[PDB]
Design brief:
heterodimer; A: alpha+beta; 5-stranded mixed β-sheet; 5 strands; about 15% helix; B: alpha+beta; ubp-family deubiquitinating enzyme fold; 8-stranded mixed β-sheet; 4-stranded antiparallel β-sheet; about 25% strand; globular; Ubiquitin carboxyl-terminal hydrolase 7 (chain B); Ubiquitin (chain A); hydrolase
Chain lengths: ~80, ~350
């Protein structure tokens, strides 16, 4: 199924995924397309940050759902 | 002091957490709901709700800076974890999700979406075939593009601007296969408490570098968003009042967080910098946090998250909270903990 990801520039890219894909798999596909290492990615969907080890179906993500890609501004 | 509010103690690198906690504490309607959570059966140091109840209680009653070691204990953290620098919006998303889940099946179930959740609609129109589609989704904050934008308004304009889906991003139009298409977003509802994440970062694939964006970017004390709705309410305009400015200094990999708030929504501002709370001016909270160039004498200090409150909701969200709002079972458990600690 094709989902959308809003990238760091605010542009929409498409991603071909399956409901059983883990969040790690999705971050690997984003790396493929956008070049961002998975360990730097955070995905926001419906107010949740998606957790490694869960699947897309765990969040009821479906065709044409939009995930929001963000980085980190770490501070102490 | 002359401020009337207390700070939070830093554990080592917990400024991001302190900045968030003040932000949530002065979301009074949320604070009162946290006070009502049925924590009586919870373990003192395992319960995130009980720890939040405790932090909030002491922020509301103490006269010295308040500690957070029981909250971080309830997160499962140990000493090392309190030295890791973190992103405040990451903590916001994780913490609120956790508290929302813990409120399910309780008398305050749904408080967090009531305060923070809006809905947007994404529509797609194919260009070469007659095929269109839309999708409506919830959000609890909004990611706003900064790079090349002067102000919040231009960011929202860009957010709702129509976008082309072509090339390696053609739209999957079902029986028509991949199709060139246009995509746009509009807001259906905006929530009483609006959290905005400024996208102050970029990634350079040529050097594997995370880079912070410190460009100037202006945000207003008052924010009208009606024009970004699918349909407006004449009895309830989407006019928003600036409540908090969560400020990051440094770069992607480290730095420091503070929060500026006018807790009452009345334009009287304070800076909350871990244990130091100090009066400040509007311009110190706002225009001074636009970013831009530094001087040669710290650096790269600017707004990262903004909190606005819908004008029509301001008196319900910032409703006063008294000791009549705190169950006496809760205050008793907190005294008990204090007395067992001093042992």
């Amino acid at each position: 199924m094709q989902i959308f990801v809003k990238t760091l520039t605010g542009k929409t890219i498409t991603l071909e995924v399956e409901p059983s894909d883990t969040i790690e798999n999705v971050k690997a596909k984003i790396q493929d397309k956008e070049g961002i290492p998975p360990d730097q990615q955070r995905l926001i969907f419906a107010g949740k940050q998606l957790e490694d080890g869960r699947t897309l179906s765990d969040y009821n993500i479906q065709k044409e759902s939009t995930l929001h890609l963000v980085l980190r501004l770490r501070g102490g | 002091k002359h401020t009337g509010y207390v700070g939070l103690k830093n554990q080592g690198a917990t400024c991001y957490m302190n900045s968030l906690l003040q932000t949530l504490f002065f979301t009074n309607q949320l604070r009162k709901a946290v006070y009502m959570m049925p924590t009586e059966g919870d373990d003192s140091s395992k319960s995130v709700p009980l720890a939040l109840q405790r932090v909030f209680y002491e922020l509301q009653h103490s006269d010295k800076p308040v500690g957070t070691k029981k909250l971080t204990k309830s997160f499962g953290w140990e000493t090392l974890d309190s030295f890791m620098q973190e992103d405040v919006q990451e903590l916001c998303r994780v913490l609120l999700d956790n508290v929302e889940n813990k409120m399910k099946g309780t008398c305050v179930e749904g408080t967090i979406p009531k305060l923070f959740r809006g809905k947007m609609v994404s529509y797609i129109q194919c260009k070469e075939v007659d095929y269109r589609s839309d999708r409506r989704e919830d959000y609890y904050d909004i990611q706003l593009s900064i790079k090349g934008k002067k102000n919040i308004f231009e960011s929202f304009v860009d957010y709702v601007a129509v976008e082309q889906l072509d090339g390696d991003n053609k739209y999957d139009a079902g029986e028509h296969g991949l199709q060139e298409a246009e995509k746009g977003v509009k807001f259906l509802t905006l929530p009483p408490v609006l959290h905005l994440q400024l996208m102050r970062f970029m990634y350079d694939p040529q050097t594997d570098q995370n880079i912070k964006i410190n460009d100037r970017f202006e945000f207003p004390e008052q924010l009208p968003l009606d024009e970004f709705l699918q349909k407006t309410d004449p009895k309830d305009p989407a006019n928003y009042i600036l409540h908090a400015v969560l400020v990051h200094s440094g770069d992607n990999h480290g730095g420091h967080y503070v929060v500026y708030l006018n807790p009452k929504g009345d334009g009287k501002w304070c800076k909350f910098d871990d244990d130091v709370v100090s009066r400040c001016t509007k311009e110190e909270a706002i225009e001074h946090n636009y970013g831009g160039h530094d001087d040669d004498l710290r650096h790269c200090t600017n707004a990262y998250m903004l909190v606005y409150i819908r004008e029509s909701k301001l008196s319900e969200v910032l409703q006063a909270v008294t000791d009549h709002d705190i169950p006496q079972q809760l205050v008793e458990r907190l005294q008990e903990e204090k007395r067992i600690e001093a042992q």
